Amino acid sequence: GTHSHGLFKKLGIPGPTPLPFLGNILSYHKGFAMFDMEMHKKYGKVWGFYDGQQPVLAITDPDMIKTVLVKEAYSVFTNRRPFGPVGFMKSAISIAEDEEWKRLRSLLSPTFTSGKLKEMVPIIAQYGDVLVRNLRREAETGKPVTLKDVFGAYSMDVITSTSFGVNIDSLNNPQDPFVENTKKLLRFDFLDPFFLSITVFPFLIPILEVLNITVFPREVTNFLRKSVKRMKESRLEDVDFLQLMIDSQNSKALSDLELVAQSIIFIFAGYETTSSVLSFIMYELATHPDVQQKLQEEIDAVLPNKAPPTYDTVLQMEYLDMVVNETLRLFPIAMRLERVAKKDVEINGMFIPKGVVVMIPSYALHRDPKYWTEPEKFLPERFSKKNKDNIDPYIYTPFGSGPRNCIGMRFALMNMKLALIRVLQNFSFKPSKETQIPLKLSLGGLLQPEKPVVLKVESR
Amino acid sequence: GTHSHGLFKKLGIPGPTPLPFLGNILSYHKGFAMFDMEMHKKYGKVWGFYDGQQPVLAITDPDMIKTVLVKEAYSVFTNRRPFGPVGFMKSAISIAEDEEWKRLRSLLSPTFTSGKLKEMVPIIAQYGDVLVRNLRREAETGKPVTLKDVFGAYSMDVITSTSFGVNIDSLNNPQDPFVENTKKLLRFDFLDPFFLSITVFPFLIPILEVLNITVFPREVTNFLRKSVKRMKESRLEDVDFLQLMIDSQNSKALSDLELVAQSIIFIFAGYETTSSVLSFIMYELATHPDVQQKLQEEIDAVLPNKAPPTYDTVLQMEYLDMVVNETLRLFPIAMRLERVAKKDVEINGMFIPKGVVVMIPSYALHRDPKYWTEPEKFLPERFSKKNKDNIDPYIYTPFGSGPRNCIGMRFALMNMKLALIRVLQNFSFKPSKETQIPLKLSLGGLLQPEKPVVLKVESR
Numbered sequence: 033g034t035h036s037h038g039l040f041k042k043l044g045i046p047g048p049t050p051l052p053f054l055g056n057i058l059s060y061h062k063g064f065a066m067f068d069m070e071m072h073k074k075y076g077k078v079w080g081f082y083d084g085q086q087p088v089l090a091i092t093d094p095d096m097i098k099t100v101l102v103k104e105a106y107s108v109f110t111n112r113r114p115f116g117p118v119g120f121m122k123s124a125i126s127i128a129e130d131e132e133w134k135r136l137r138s139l140l141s142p143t144f145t146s147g148k149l150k151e152m153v154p155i156i157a158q159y160g161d162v163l164v165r166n167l168r169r170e171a172e173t174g175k176p177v178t179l180k181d182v183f184g185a186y187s188m189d190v191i192t193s194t195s196f197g198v199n200i201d202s203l204n205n206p207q208d209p210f211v212e213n214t215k216k217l218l219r220f221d222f223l224d225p226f227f228l229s230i231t232v233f234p235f236l237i238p239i240l241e242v243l244n245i246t247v248f249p250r251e252v253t254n255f256l257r258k259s260v261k262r263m264k265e266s267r268l269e270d271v272d273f274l275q276l277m278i279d280s281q282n283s284k285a286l287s288d289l290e291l292v293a294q295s296i297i298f299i300f301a302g303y304e305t306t307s308s309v310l311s312f313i314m315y316e317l318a319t320h321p322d323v324q325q326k327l328q329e330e331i332d333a334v335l336p337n338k339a340p341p342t343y344d345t346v347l348q349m350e351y352l353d354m355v356v357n358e359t360l361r362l363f364p365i366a367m368r369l370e371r372v373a374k375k376d377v378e379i380n381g382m383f384i385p386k387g388v389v390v391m392i393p394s395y396a397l398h399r400d401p402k403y404w405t406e407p408e409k410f411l412p413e414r415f416s417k418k419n420k421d422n423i424d425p426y427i428y429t430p431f432g433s434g435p436r437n438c439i440g441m442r443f444a445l446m447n448m449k450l451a452l453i454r455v456l457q458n459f460s461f462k463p464s465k466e467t468q469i470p471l472k473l474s475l476g477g478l479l480q481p482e483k484p485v486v487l488k489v490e491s492r
Numbered sequence: 493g494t495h496s497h498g499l500f501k502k503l504g505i506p507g508p509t510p511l512p513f514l515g516n517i518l519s520y521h522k523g524f525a526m527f528d529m530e531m532h533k534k535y536g537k538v539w540g541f542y543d544g545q546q547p548v549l550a551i552t553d554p555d556m557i558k559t560v561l562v563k564e565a566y567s568v569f570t571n572r573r574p575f576g577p578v579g580f581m582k583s584a585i586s587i588a589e590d591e592e593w594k595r596l597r598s599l600l601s602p603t604f605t606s607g608k609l610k611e612m613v614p615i616i617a618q619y620g621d622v623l624v625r626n627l628r629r630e631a632e633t634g635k636p637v638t639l640k641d642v643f644g645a646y647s648m649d650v651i652t653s654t655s656f657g658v659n660i661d662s663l664n665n666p667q668d669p670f671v672e673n674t675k676k677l678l679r680f681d682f683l684d685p686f687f688l689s690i691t692v693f694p695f696l697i698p699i700l701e702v703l704n705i706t707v708f709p710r711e712v713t714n715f716l717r718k719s720v721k722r723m724k725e726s727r728l729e730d731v732d733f734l735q736l737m738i739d740s741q742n743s744k745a746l747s748d749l750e751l752v753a754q755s756i757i758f759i760f761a762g763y764e765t766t767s768s769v770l771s772f773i774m775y776e777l778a779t780h781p782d783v784q785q786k787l788q789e790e791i792d793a794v795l796p797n798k799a800p801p802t803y804d805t806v807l808q809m810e811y812l813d814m815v816v817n818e819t820l821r822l823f824p825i826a827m828r829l830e831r832v833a834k835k836d837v838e839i840n841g842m843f844i845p846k847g848v849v850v851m852i853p854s855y856a857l858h859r860d861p862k863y864w865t866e867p868e869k870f871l872p873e874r875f876s877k878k879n880k881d882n883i884d885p886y887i888y889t890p891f892g893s894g895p896r897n898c899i900g901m902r903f904a905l906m907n908m909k910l911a912l913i914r915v916l917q918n919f920s921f922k923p924s925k926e927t928q929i930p931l932k933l934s935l936g937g938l939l940q941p942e943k944p945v946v947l948k949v950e951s952r
């Protein structure tokens with residue numbers, strides 16, 4: 033109906049007037065980012081809209097954002113919006129709620145410490161070497177390279193080896209059953225017809241769940257469930273995420289099925305995200321030769337030509353950090369951050385009813401001219417140690433913020449940097465005739481290039 | 493979704509471009525009649541629209557209308573659009589389909605013959621007398637009279653006595669259990685929130701039916717079911733619709749439950765319809781004193797003052813027939829006629845896919861300036877025996893047409909005429925200060941005055 037559709041009107045909150053049943057979902061016809069940009073421009077600091085019957089409050093004031101993401105994380109804003117239909121993946125840390133979430137976050141946090149990270153570096157390193165060799169041969173036969181294919185394959189190689197201990201060159205072994213399964217763990221397009229229908233008829237989710245219909249492919253999760261079981265029967269008895277998880281449940285203990293839910297959600301959270309960002313980075317480097325050259329000069333200085341990167345030397349590369357951060361400013365692939373008000377609240381003068389989704393529009397904030405000079409331009413100096421103090425951590429939020437921020441942030445940052453270093457040590461990347469310049473974005477539910485980035489790759 | 497929403501586009505048929513999920517239902521914001529008028533003006537002869545995902549083809553060419561309502565009634569256009577949730581009322585003749593319908597129509601047709609009608613006339617007559625006495629006393633204490641209350645009560649008195657043999661003065665016995673139940677059998681507002689939701693989510697109807705949720709009030713049908721049973725146990729053993737029905741099943745025979753379904757649907761089809769039209773007629777007569785006076789003169793001529801009307805004398809009153817017909821031209825209370833294409837068809841050059849609802853917009857056609865001079869004016873002479881041959885029976889369709897037209901047409905016409913005669917013999921009807929002039933129509937799903945017609949009633 034429209035019973036909920038008078039909420040923001042009643043609170044004096046501005047926003048696009050909702051249609052019966054649909055709410056404002058027709059405003060998604062150009063994707064999430066364009067919707068949020070336009071609403072921001074038109075309504076200002078705060079606006080309300082409806083995903084079907086679901087009220088969503090967008091906030092843009094960084095003190096408000098602090099209150100939601102940090103200060104009242106545990107009291108009120110603990111969970112993201114409910115998500116289904118799911119089966120056992122209900123126990124995935126990204127989907128879990130309240131005490132169940134707070135428990136998983138505790139069990140898993142030790143796994144993502146820098147100390148653990150540093151021990152994982154040799155493994156990630158090995159597939160940098162693989163990425164290079166794959167790159168090199170796709171180059172010495174001089175045709176333009178599809179980044180998503182080579183970085184996609186890199187993204188997988190690193191997850192498997194660092195999570196399970198499965199050591200596969202996915203690019204050259206694409207019909208390996210493990211590869212064929214895990215490669216299906218792509219990000220959801222919440223603007224596709226199934227999810228729009230679920231948004232308009234959310235009362236159908238329980239019907240789907242009772243039939244065990246789930247948006248995580250059953251065949252894949254079944255396969256991974258069986259794989260995990262056999263590896264646990266290979267480790268017991270005879271350095272990866274699985275081992276650390278195996279060891280932790282070896283004590284309120286990581287259940288068997290819970291363990292596998294986390295393994296799967298890690299792939300899901302890390303696979304296409306990491307691939308996408310690396311593609312964006314290489315696009316920026318290719319279209320800004322001066323930046324690519326300067327980055328190559330830093331790498332060569334820190335690592336006298338082609339010395340292998342280490343954890344310590346990665347942390348030494350300031351310009352590398354700037355390029356990664358500025359690319360993430362332009363392309364915050366989550367686009368929005370979300371928390372549900374689990375009870376009535378009044379934050380910074382504004383009353384928010386229980387059940388409202390409070391949304392932080394990262395993409396819109398990242399490109400807001402009020403906080404960023406020439407926001408559409410790629411300018412790494414934004415993040416130089418001189419200019420860096422100028423950056424509000426509640427305006428710049430590519431990994432979110434607070435207790436429920438990206439738990440794999442450190443790993444993803446390290447992963448990408450190690451990829452970039454090895455790749456840049458060996459090659460230069462340049463536009464091809466069929467490089468899309470300037471880059472156009474998908475008008476779908478995922479922040480990605482409209483067409484895959486294709487670059488000419490030249491050996492140094 | 494919108495899979496169906498490209499149908500008319502594919503057939504080159506014009507119409508309002510549909511929204512996802514909703515189709516064109518937001519176009520109903522001013523009711524059915526205004527929607528059809530506007531679409532007619534804007535698209536012309538034919539147009540297509542979507543009630544949710546359901547394609548509806550509106551036709552206005554009288555040869556096309558003939559083909560649908562008459563020529564291909566049995567082959568293709570046998571049923572109206574499916575209607576639920578219903579329980580046992582599935583076997584009501586108005587709701588039944590195909591062979592089940594064709595059977596019920598045969599079993600029930602003998603009941604609505606003129607010969608039967610004439611035998612029912614004394615019974616209907618008695619409640620004309622009751623209507624008058626009720627009117628007279630509400631008048632001699634001189635306050636403006638709410639037509640829907642007095643005609644509403646008349647409408648019920650005639651159904652009960654002529655259908656079951658229940659003889660009640662409903663106006664003065666409003667808490668009689670029979671009255672209290674039957675008075676709930678009002679017409680559905682298909683633009684109310686429940687029906688709009690069912691239109692957008694028709695896949696929910698079977699879920700409702702398996703829980704025996706039904707749009708016919710269960711308490712009422714239960715009561716009427718029990719009543720019918722006790723009267724059948726009073727007739728057996730020891731002139732109305734029930735008796736004629738009782739006698740017919742006394743032989744492919746009218747089942748017990750089927751009998752009761754028909755009794756109920758008759759009330760439903762006859763109660764508010766008859767009341768509404770009588771109210772419209774009195775409104776026209778009150779606002780056109782010359783017409784009311786001329787009608788009173790005919791009645792007095794045919795029935796030398798206050799002689800009781802008979803079947804034969806009713807048929808003698810030409811100006812009475814003209815006034816009734818012209819009121820029905822202005823206010824065709826069904827508004828639309830509908831048939832579903834049960835298979836693919838090509839009528840008059842135009843292909844119509846199986847499953848499309850073909851709709852004839854009676855209200856729009858009744859007020860179409862191309863077929864009617866000054867269509868908004870009340871002009872009984874339209875239907876004078878001189879001008880009457882000028883009337884296309886597929887443009888003027890207040891009772892529909894073909895094998896599935898209004899089976900109670902004769903009865904309803906006789907009923908109203910007998911009411912009007914008795915009422916006009918005794919009173920004159922005039923505007924009150926709070927009479928709405930000109931009359932405004934409801935913007936809801938039912939063709940009715942926006943506010944109830946209230947008239948000053950004066951004894952002759």
Ligand code: HEM
Pocket residue numbers: 125126127137297298301302303305306309364365366369370429430431432433434435436437438439440441443444445
């Ligand atoms: C550059 C790549 C990545 C980006 C841009 C990214 C971004 C994000 C963002 C914005 C959130 C939501 C934070 C919030 O709501 O405040 C998130 C959550 C999460 N991410 Fe990442 N992520 C990336 C890679 C990874 C990787 C490699 C992992 C590996 C484990 C991972 C695991 C997770 C998990 C488990 C959550 C949910 C945390 C929770 O609910 O407790 N992500 N990510």
Ligand code: HEM
Pocket residue numbers: 585586587597757758761762763765766769824825826829830889890891892893894895896897898899900901903904905
């Ligand atoms: C002035 C009052 C009335 C008007 C304007 C009216 C009008 C209509 C219309 C337009 C239809 C659809 C015809 C078609 O689809 O071609 C219809 C159907 C029907 N009407 Fe009436 N009606 C009235 C009174 C009555 C009464 C008193 C009865 C008593 C039995 C009745 C019984 C029915 C039935 C059973 C149907 C469905 C017939 C079938 O599907 O076979 N109506 N009516």
